[PDB]
Design a protein around this ligand. Structure first.
Ligand SMILES: C=C1/C(=C\C=C2/CCC[C@@]3(C)[C@H]2CC[C@]3(C)C#CC#CC(C)(C)O)C[C@@H](O)C[C@@H]1O
Lengths: 10, 239
């Protein structure tokens, strides 16, 4: 559900 | 005396901060420019979105944060982001100007600027009183970094699952901070408690900011000025 966050968290 | 492991936590936290806080503020010129209707919303939205990315980078270098589940990492970040930003912003705050000075005069933000972005004095009054009192604490860099890390690793946030692990992370950081102040901060007998108090103020600042964010986000003419990262991190979705 948290797309950008998941990406930013590698 | 401080242990080898305690000082390692300190080192890796200081390093993490120096990697994610650019005292030159030369990245700010990339934001949508300030306008001084909500004229400051575009620039400050970009300021906040930029800062979230830095906070995620700091978090990823806190010992143990990366070993949490992604859900807890997200939960900890969605609840604590605005607090870490208020904390880290003390580094640009100035008692002289009672404002945040980030290099040039176009990147100096006083209270009136922040109202032109949709926030009221019921947020800005306690915030600026928080910034001056925290600035007065004259924190060492080691202490500033420990407080940000402690604030982030708080188990009493909506959504965290592995409460026990996060509380233990936070306990270790507190022991490091208590020891550090004791050994290395002369005249700091009451400093630890004053810092723990600031964590309590941060929660009240958080709530007020969330309140005012909602009225911004429920007005599409305003919410459209936000960034995708801001809308996601401050949005009310759950994983
Ligand atoms: C941010 C940082 C800095 C300044 C912090 C400031 C000054 C501008 C207004 C801000 C941002 C405030 C922190 C909280 C507040 C009052 C807010 C807000 C909001 C909002 C929305 C509209 C998104 O709801 C400068 C440097 O020290 C880097 C640091 O990272």
């Amino acid at each position: 559900k948290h797309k950008i966050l998941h990406r930013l968290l590698q | 005396m401080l242990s080898d492991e305690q000082m390692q936590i300190i080192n890796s936290l200081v390093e993490a901060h120096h990697k994610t806080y650019d005292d030159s503020y030369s990245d700010f010129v990339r934001f949508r420019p300030p306008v001084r209707r909500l004229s400051m919303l575009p620039h400050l939205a970009d300021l906040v979105s930029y800062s979230i990315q830095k906070v995620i980078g700091f978090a990823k270098m806190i010992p143990g944060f990366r070993d949490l589940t992604a859900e807890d990492q997200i939960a900890l970040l969605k609840s604590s982001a605005i607090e870490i930003i208020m904390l880290r912003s003390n580094q640009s705050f100035s008692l002289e100007d009672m404002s945040w000075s980030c290099g040039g005069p176009d990147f100096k933000y006083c209270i009136n600027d922040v109202t032109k972005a949709g926030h009221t004095l019921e947020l800005l009054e306690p915030l600026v009183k928080f910034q001056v009192g925290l600035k007065k604490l004259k924190l060492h860099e080691e202490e500033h970094v420990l407080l940000m890390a402690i604030c982030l690793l708080s188990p009493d946030r909506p959504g965290v699952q592995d409460h026990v692990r996060i509380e233990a992370l936070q306990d270790r950081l507190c022991d490091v901070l208590q020891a550090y102040i004791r050994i290395q901060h002369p005249g700091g007998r009451l400093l630890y408690a004053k810092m723990i108090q600031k964590l309590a103020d941060l929660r009240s600042l958080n709530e007020e900011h969330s309140k005012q964010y909602r009225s911004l986000s429920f007005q599409p003419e305003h919410s459209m000025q936000l960034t995708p990262l801001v809308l996601e991190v401050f949005g009310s979705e759950v994983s």
